[PDB]
Every structure is written in structure tokens, then in C-alpha cells.
Amino acid sequence: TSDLIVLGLPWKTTEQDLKEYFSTFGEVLMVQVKKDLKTGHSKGFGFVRFTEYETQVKVMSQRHMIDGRWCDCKLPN
DNA sequence: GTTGAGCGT
């Protein structure tokens, strides 16, 4: 398993929210929501790591409606 | 108090 980058997150979406959402597919190791260090405002993308590689491809294969926006899980660059 | 292609100290 590898980290997946999550593009398109609503600005209000928190690491708590991601954990909840992604947990529905499989077991989650960690989630991150990248934020500006001065203001804490989310930058609109984050990361996720699953324990099971099965869950990763399942998640990588489809778009995701998270808090009102379609999001994409890709392999980072 | 804003936005929507954005890739991580």
C-alpha cells in the first residue's frame, strides 16, 4: 500500500471527516488534510493510507462525493 | 469572513 493524494476537498473538510468517509471502504491507517501553517485554512487536498491494498485500488478507481464535492484519489507525483 | 488543477517540512 502507498499514500493516495486526495484532490478537491471542500475547505471545511477535516481529518475527522475524511477518516469517517474513507473508513466505509476499509481500515484506514492515517489521513491528513494539508493546511496553511499560519491560518489553519485547508488547502483543499490531503492524503490517506489504507492497511489493505484491496481497499486502496477500490478507492483509487472511483470518484468520491465528500462534503458536497466530487474528489479524486490519485497516486502522488 | 473570499477560492477550486491542487502533490506532502
Numbering used by the authors: 103 to 179
What do the authors report?
However, further studies have revealed that TDP-43 is primarily an RNA-binding protein with multiple roles in the regulation of mRNA splicing, translation and transportation, and it is also present in Drosha complex for micro RNA processing and in stress granules for protecting mRNAs in stress conditions. Yet TDP-43 is abnormally aggregated forming inclusions in neuronal cells in amyotrophic lateral sclerosis (ALS) and frontotemporal lobar degeneration (FTLD).
Various DNA and RNA with different sequences and lengths, including TG repeats and UG repeats, were used to co-crystallize with hRRM1, but only a single-stranded 10-nt DNA (5′-GTTGASeGCGTT-3′) with a 2′-methylseleno-adenosine (ASe) could be co-crystallized with hRRM1. The final refined model contained one hRRM1 polypeptide chain (residues 103–179) and one ssDNA (G1 to T9) with an R-factor/R-free of 20.65/25.86% for 4301/430 reflections up to a resolution of 2.75 Å. The overall crystal structure of the hRRM1-DNA complex showed that hRRM1 had an αβ sandwich structure containing a five-stranded β-sheet packed against two α-helices. The ssDNA was bound on the flat surface of the β-sheet of hRRM1 interacting mainly with RNP2 and RNP1 segments. Similar to the classical RRM proteins, the conserved I107 in RNP2 formed nonbonded interactions with C7 and the conserved F149 in RNP1 stacked with G8. G4 inserted into the surface cleft, stacking with W113 (in Loop 1) and R171, and formed extensive hydrogen bonds with hRRM1: N1 and N2 to L111 (backbone O); O6 to W113 (backbone N); N2 to G146 (backbone O); N7 to R171 (Nη1). In summary, hRRM1 bound the ssDNA via nonbonded, π-π stacking interactions and hydrogen bonding, and it might specify the preference for a GC-rich sequence: X-G4-X-G6-C7-G8.
